[PDB]
DNA sequence: TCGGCTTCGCGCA
DNA sequence: TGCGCGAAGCCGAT
């Protein structure tokens, strides 16, 4: 669909039909930026083919009902300095409310559009919406990846055992798919309040709210700024000052020495193709480059290709056979200690490491790499089943984690659970071959009581 | 039919 | 802290 800086590959047809007369709509879903886009710049390029506007609209769903205040603000403030950021580049933004299967098809034909598109992602209730949008619309639509930097269809066309199959197909791509993002052209024809919605899904969430004893929130939101111009600066700060250290000190919890970039990574507000770019011609230790460079390019866009291929990849049938046979035999181990998800939640464990972890998280709202790998391994130690580890794990995260709700989250905790692209180990009583993960292991690769200290 | 597995624990400089 | 080894099942290059 024409285009000179302008990759096919990273674009698929999902429905075929008649390009109508009206304005290309970009279904802005997962990648909530301007800049660095290639499904807004996809969706640019066939408005300017057919002589057309190019629009943006952005359907808000109930699925913050399902989540706290600290992903609500963060995501509708982003949201704000986007509609202004569209609105110099002559862009309209058109926010719904409702079922995007439902909103977007009556969207399509009363506004007379021409052409759709989206962004890709490989959760299970974007793929039923896409269903629902193509038995209710006439015009062809399309999807662009816009998440990864190889196209996720295009980098496998399986499920990937683990990083060691994966980095070669990947790496392979790069001089292909890794290039500089062409600039937004803006709009040479022109044609709900975000506060309201603030204000009102706000009210809804705050009887649920996170509360200490004194009825005081838990959260801190000034760790994070959200936004798209705060996100590229957190990517400055990272190579200029913290891009050297990372390969020494990423699974040293007591130094804030990663990149801080998940939260804005999750919704979108910073291109991954953009923070590699800039990555690549940082003049750094070669190390640190490579160690990051591994969690950003194969660590992320495997946990797309984990979900893509998997659509159980948040339950016990995604873990493979071996790790699922061992759990299944240690299912009548006397566990050590029983916690139900109230327990786990407040931090009411016996583990004081485990608590400052989960503190770390009720807290900030982004808990240390590191720490969220024993997090949830003593989960599986400390529960009724393996079942209801994968349920209390995905639950804590998900309602917690800025960057919950992603394919990062679920292949993370299947790493930890389930072993996915993970190897067996010393059997053990309980978690079997699962890798284990102790704190006198952590108490000889950090201080393990600077850390307890700062979360209590 | 081997070789090596992100993110392990453990003994030893 | 940094290093080599143990302990485990399997992909994939052949
Ligand atoms: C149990 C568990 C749950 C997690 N929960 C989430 C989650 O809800 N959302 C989320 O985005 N990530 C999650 N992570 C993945 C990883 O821990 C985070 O990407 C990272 O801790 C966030 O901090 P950072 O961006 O500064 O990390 P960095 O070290 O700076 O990593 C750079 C980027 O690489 C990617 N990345 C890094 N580590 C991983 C990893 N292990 N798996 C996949 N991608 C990775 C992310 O996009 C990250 O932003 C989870 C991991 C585990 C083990």
Redesign the pocket.
Same mark, same amino acid.
């Given at each position: 669909p024409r285009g000179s800086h302008m990759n096919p590959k990273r674009i698929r047809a999902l429905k075929s039909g008649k390009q109508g007369d009206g304005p290309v709509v970009y279904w802005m879903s997962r990648d909530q930026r301007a800049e660095d886009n290639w499904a807004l710049l996809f969706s640019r390029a066939i408005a300017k083919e057919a002589n057309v506007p190019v629009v943006v609209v952005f359907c808000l769903t109930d699925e913050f009902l399902e989540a706290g205040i600290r992903q609500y603000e963060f995501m509708l403030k982003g949201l704000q300095e986007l509609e202004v950021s569209l609105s110099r580049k002559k862009i309209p933004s058109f926010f719904l409310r409702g079922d995007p299967g439902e909103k977007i098809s009556r969207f399509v034909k009363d506004y007379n559009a021409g052409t759709l598109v989206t962004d890709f992602s490989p959760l299970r209730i974007k793929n039923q919406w896409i269903e629902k949008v193509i038995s209710g619309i006439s015009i062809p639509f399309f999807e662009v990846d816009a998440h990864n930097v190889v196209p996720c269809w295009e980098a496998s066309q399986?499920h990937?055992?683990?990083?060691?199959?994966f980095?070669?197909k990947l790496y392979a791509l790069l001089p292909e798919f890794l290039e500089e993002f062409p600039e937004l052209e803006p709009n040479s024809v022109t044609p709900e309040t975000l506060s309201d919605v603030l204000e009102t899904g706000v009210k809804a969430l705050l009887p649920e709210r996170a509360l200490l004893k004194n009825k005081d929130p838990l959260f801190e939101p000034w760790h994070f700024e959200p936004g798209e111009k705060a996100a590229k600066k957190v990517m400055e700060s990272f190579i200029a000052d913290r891009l050297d250290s990372y390969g020494?000190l990423?699974?040293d919890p007591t130094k804030n020495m990663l990149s801080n970039l998940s939260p804005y990574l999750h919704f979108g507000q910073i291109s991954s193709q953009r923070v590699v770019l800039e990555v690549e011609k940082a003049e750094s230790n070669p190390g640190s480059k490579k160690a990051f460079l591994?969690?950003i390019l194969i660590?992320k866009e495997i946990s797309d290709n984990f979900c893509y291929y998997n659509p159980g990849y948040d339950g016990f049938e995604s873990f493979?056979?071996?790790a699922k046979?061992?759990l299944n035999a240690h299912r009548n181990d006397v566990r050590s200690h029983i916690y139900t998800l109230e327990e786990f939640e407040a931090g009411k464990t016996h583990d004081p490491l485990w608590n400052a972890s989960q503190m770390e998280l009720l807290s900030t709202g982004k808990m240390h790499?590191?720490t969220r790998?024993?997090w949830a391994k003593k989960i599986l130690e400390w529960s009724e089943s393996p079942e209801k580890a994968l349920e209390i794990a995905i639950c804590l995260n998900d309602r917690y984690e800025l960057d919950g709700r992603d394919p990062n989250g679920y292949a993370?905790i299947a790493?930890s659970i389930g072993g996915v692209?993970? +190897?067996?180990?010393?059997?053990?009583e309980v978690t079997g =071959?699962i +890798?284990?993960?102790?704190?006198?292991?952590?108490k000889? =690769?950090f201080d393990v009581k600077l850390y307890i200290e700062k979360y209590s």
């Amino acid at each position: 669909p024409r285009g000179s800086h302008m990759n096919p590959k990273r674009i698929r047809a999902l429905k075929s039909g008649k390009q109508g007369d009206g304005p290309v709509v970009y279904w802005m879903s997962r990648d909530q930026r301007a800049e660095d886009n290639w499904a807004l710049l996809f969706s640019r390029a066939i408005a300017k083919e057919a002589n057309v506007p190019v629009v943006v609209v952005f359907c808000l769903t109930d699925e913050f009902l399902e989540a706290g205040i600290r992903q609500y603000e963060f995501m509708l403030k982003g949201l704000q300095e986007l509609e202004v950021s569209l609105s110099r580049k002559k862009i309209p933004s058109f926010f719904l409310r409702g079922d995007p299967g439902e909103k977007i098809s009556r969207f399509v034909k009363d506004y007379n559009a021409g052409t759709l598109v989206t962004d890709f992602s490989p959760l299970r209730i974007k793929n039923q919406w896409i269903e629902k949008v193509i038995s209710g619309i006439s015009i062809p639509f399309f999807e662009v990846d816009a998440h990864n930097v190889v196209p996720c269809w295009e980098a496998s066309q399986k499920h990937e055992y683990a990083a060691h199959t994966f980095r070669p197909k990947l790496y392979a791509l790069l001089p292909e798919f890794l290039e500089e993002f062409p600039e937004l052209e803006p709009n040479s024809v022109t044609p709900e309040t975000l506060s309201d919605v603030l204000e009102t899904g706000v009210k809804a969430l705050l009887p649920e709210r996170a509360l200490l004893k004194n009825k005081d929130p838990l959260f801190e939101p000034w760790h994070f700024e959200p936004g798209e111009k705060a996100a590229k600066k957190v990517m400055e700060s990272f190579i200029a000052d913290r891009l050297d250290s990372y390969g020494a000190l990423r699974n040293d919890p007591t130094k804030n020495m990663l990149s801080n970039l998940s939260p804005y990574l999750h919704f979108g507000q910073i291109s991954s193709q953009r923070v590699v770019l800039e990555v690549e011609k940082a003049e750094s230790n070669p190390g640190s480059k490579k160690a990051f460079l591994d969690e950003i390019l194969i660590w992320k866009e495997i946990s797309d290709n984990f979900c893509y291929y998997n659509p159980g990849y948040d339950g016990f049938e995604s873990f493979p056979s071996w790790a699922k046979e061992s759990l299944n035999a240690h299912r009548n181990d006397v566990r050590s200690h029983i916690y139900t998800l109230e327990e786990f939640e407040a931090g009411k464990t016996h583990d004081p490491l485990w608590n400052a972890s989960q503190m770390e998280l009720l807290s900030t709202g982004k808990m240390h790499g590191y720490t969220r790998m024993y997090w949830a391994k003593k989960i599986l130690e400390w529960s009724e089943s393996p079942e209801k580890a994968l349920e209390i794990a995905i639950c804590l995260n998900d309602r917690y984690e800025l960057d919950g709700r992603d394919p990062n989250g679920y292949a993370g905790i299947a790493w930890s659970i389930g072993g996915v692209h993970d +190897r067996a180990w010393g059997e053990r009583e309980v978690t079997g =071959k699962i +890798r284990y993960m102790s704190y006198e292991g952590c108490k000889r =690769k950090f201080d393990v009581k600077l850390y307890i200290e700062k979360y209590s």
